[PDB]
Write a protein that binds this ligand. Sequence first.
Ligand SMILES: [Fe+3]
Ligand SMILES: [Fe+3]
Length: 220
Amino acid sequence: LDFASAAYREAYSRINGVVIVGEGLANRHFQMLARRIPADRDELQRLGRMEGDHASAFVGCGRNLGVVADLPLARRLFQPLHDLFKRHDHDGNRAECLVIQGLIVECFAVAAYRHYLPVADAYARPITAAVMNDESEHLDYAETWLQRHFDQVKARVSAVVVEALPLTLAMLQSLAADMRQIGMDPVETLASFSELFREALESVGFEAVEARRLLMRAAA
Ligand SMILES: [Fe+3]
Ligand SMILES: [Fe+3]
């Protein structure tokens, strides 16, 4: 792939834009969670600050390429998912907020970065791999909490998953053409997401059979 080509730099502006905004929103999400899970306020605030650092790292990746990131477009694609999160926050639905940011968004980030890594430029590759090392800490928090409460939350989790997964699938469809132009296979990226996200649901308490069902539902 030619990093100087028009097709690459245009698609890159948009994928980098989504990454930058998404990391931004992950920061905002953890801060909202911190102010509703007082027991782990310090921890959640550190995780949020981690997201801040991820955002500025990816800001630098685009500046290394000399591409301006399309932040307006990213703000637009993220609005349905962020609203859904803002609605759960507003009703004190900390469980559903944790599934959205902590499992769904985190697993999408991991899937995306896994597929970007082998086609990333030499500046971006180390940074990307380090960011990937951080996201397990984010996943473990959400998995631990949700596991501890599995019994009270299970139904609410299944339901928020059904609401949320479609929004992230719409984002992916929108971005699939750009992902191809920067060397990511959006089909294989989605597959990786599915594997990761099933591992996460398992890890909470869902039966392997139930994990697959809840996903396939959301697919169809
Ligand atoms: Fe992050
Ligand atoms: Fe994260």
